[PDB]
Structure formats: structure tokens, C-alpha cells
Amino acid sequence: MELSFGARAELPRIHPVASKLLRLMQKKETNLCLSADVSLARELLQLADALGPSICMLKTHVDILNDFTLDVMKELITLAKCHEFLIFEDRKFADIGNTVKKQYEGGIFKIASWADLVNAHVVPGSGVVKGLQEVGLPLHRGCLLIAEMSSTGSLATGDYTRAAVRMAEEHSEFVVGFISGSRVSMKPEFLHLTPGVQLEAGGDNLGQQYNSPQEVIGKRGSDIIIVGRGIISAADRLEAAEMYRKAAWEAYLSRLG
């Protein structure tokens, strides 16, 4: 009895950020998250503008942006609102208490002021979520927990993955889903986002297991593919984004029937 993204957007227990995301995924026929792994604001904003219509989400690492300013993030929000996608800062918070709250709210980056979504590692225990949620809940934000990783020798397996799912379940006021390789929660209110995605069979030198959109959306039951190199390193990034969008969207339709 799998529901469409549009029906999941209306579930009683849905988080508002998850509902906004699921609605624009259904409207735009996209379950693609672009990993915007670039060092200069001009390239980030040119990709966000050109690929905005093709994506449900843009995943940032603002700590690699050589020319970060808050005005760059204002311009990115303008594009996110115009093209209808969420901004996900892949900060991988992994600390607790006042320090994690300040890392999310403060410093130079003021992540909570512009990121719809952030993510967290669960290794510290639920203190990571409790610290972030003190900031994030009043700012109406959401969080993704890293339940599994694509990297060679990942320790996010077995009881660790089950601990991530329990932590999400128990903090559903703020946690809206997972970074994972597959469906890890049976609750349809949670989103599953999967990195390590490319159309070809292949790998990289620093250690990652790659899978196709058809495998991770169609067979493994994830919702959204996160794609970096497969798009960013292509000559025509718009056509590459469209190839990934069509792959992920059809894999989704086929699992719905």
C-alpha cells in the first residue's frame, strides 16, 4: 500500500518541511537532490538557477565556498523559492549541547538562517538532535539522520542503523528522514535520501560504493537520489541532471505501479 509523494505530503504525522518537499517533488516530477560540490559562489548560483527546475533539493557544503557571504545565501534562497527546491546543508553535525546549537545558529555561516534541512551523525547519542532541535524547532527547520553511509568500511550498519531509526522515531517533531542506502524506516512520514549514485557501474579512489537510480529508488526503496560528480563533472550539467531526474522518477513510478 505504498503512497505517492503527494499523498505522503498529507499524512497526519508529516513534518511541515517534509510535506513542502514531497509536494514539490510530486508537482515537478523530481526526486533528484543536486550535490553542489563547488568552491565559488558564482558557479553555485549558476548551477542552482539552471538546474533548479530539475531538482527537489540542493545539497550544500558552505564550508568549502572560498567566497561565502550571507548575501550569497540570500541569492540562493531567491533561486530556491523561484524554482521550488529545498536547501540542505550537509554539515554532518556530530556533537551535543550548547556547542552544536551555536554551530547550527551562529558563527560566520548562520546555517539555520538559510538551510531548510541539515543532517547529523547519531554516534554521540540523541544529544545531537536535542541540541540542534533547540535552535531548529523555533525556526521551523528539519533534520536528517545518517543511518547508513556509501563509504568503504562504514560502521553505520546493524545496531547503529537501528539506533538511528529509533532516534528519528522518537524526535519526529524535528527529524524528517535519513541519509541511507535503502529504506530503513517502515513509517511513510520519513524521507530516505541516498548518496553514492551514478548511472554507470563504477567507483572512486577515496572509497565509495556506487549504485544506479533504478537500484536505490526501485529495488532498495529510497525516495531521493543525491548526485554530485555524475552531474557536476559533465560538460552539459543540465542534460546530466535531466538524465538523473528521469531515471529516479521512473524508478519511483515503477515501485508505485
Place this chain on the structure above:
Amino acid sequence: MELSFGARAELPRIHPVASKLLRLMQKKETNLCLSADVSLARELLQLADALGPSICMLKTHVDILNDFTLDVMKELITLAKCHEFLIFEDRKFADIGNTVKKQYEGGIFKIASWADLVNAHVVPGSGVVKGLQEVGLPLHRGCLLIAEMSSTGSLATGDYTRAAVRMAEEHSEFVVGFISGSRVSMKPEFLHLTPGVQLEAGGDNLGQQYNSPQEVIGKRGSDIIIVGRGIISAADRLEAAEMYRKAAWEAYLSRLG
């Protein structure tokens, strides 16, 4: 057959950063790392100058510094050289490949340009160390692996902790020790740094287990205490630092005999 810090500094397999640290610990009679958990550059530099003589290390979170500039970090290096302490950026890297290398080398913070030490979570597998070491080794830096955490519900236990020790052992050209609650490696070339330290029995709301300097240095065999609130929230931060330094140093002497 436990060796003094000064003798460990001369071990054949010692990393140069570990050797520098162990030598200044012995010279200054300090195994205290100050957690400089402040939001303004003026307070960070005033603490580093006043407490510099009492500490072997200053642990930073530059991503909480509201007025970060690279010129602030130049001024901090001047103090670190004058007073003889290392700078440890507690960034908790927890990603792989080109992204982790850029997070360490690049963006606004240019962490590798000023941090003697950084730390990493081991959950992604050895890719985190391989990515950092591509930057860190040419810059003659070191890394600490997070083998255990002080936080309530930490998953850094059992086989996870053993995986951290194996990863350190196998990357000894860059990894110089651990964040841990106790000695986790029997190899004296590794440093053990322990957070969650206060003189009184007690706890905090966001979830941490605290232990005394005598317990973690004397009984649990760690090398260095990391202290934040116990010093930073005191009226007289210099006297507080001296109380922690004397506690940790005597616990060390007593375990040596």
C-alpha cells in the same frame, strides 16, 4: 614500564606533532587542554594569552566565532608560539574524499593553515583519514580519532572503539591519538585526550557523563584532560585553569610512581 611524557617524545615511531606536544607538556608540567568555547575573538585571544602558560593545548570551534577572520588565527598562532601550546580545531570531520580535503584546507576557515591538530569521527571508515591526510601530511599536521564520547547514549563503544584503534594504528603517519574516556591503545606513541572533566561530581542538561582529573588520568590512563565549563564559567579563569592543571599533573605523576 610506563614512560614519562618526555621519554614518549623520543620514541622511534613518535609523530613530530605528538613529540612537540609531549615535550612542552613535560617542560611546562601541564596536561590540560582548554576548551575555548567562546563566540568573540577578543575573549578567545584574552583567554589564550592569560591561560597559555597553564595549558598544553587550546581546543577551538572556529565555526562558533561570530567575528572569525584569518587575522584572528594569526594572532592565536603568535600566542601559541609565545606560551608554547598546540591549537586543536575540534571540527569532528566525518566525510571522505575531495569534500573532506576541501573542508580541511579551504573555504573561509582554511583550518589546516593554523590548526596543529584536528579530529575525526571513524563512522565513515578510513576514507576520512585518507582524505584529511592528503592535505595534512604535506602540512606536517596531526589528527585525533574519536574512539569514545562522554555523551549519554554514545554509540562509540565495543567494536566501534576497536575499529578506531585499528584505523589509528594503520595511519600512524598522520593519526597521533584519540579522543577517548580512557586508554584505548597500548602503544605509547598515541596520545589520549579526555573531555567530560570537572573537579566536582555532576552533569549537564544536554547529556554528558563527567569524571574527575584523578579518575581519567590516574585510574583510566588518559594523558590529557579537556576542560571547558569548569574553567570558562568560573569568575577567575586563571585560578580555575591552575586547579585543573595541578589535578591532572599530579594524577599523571602518581601513575608513573
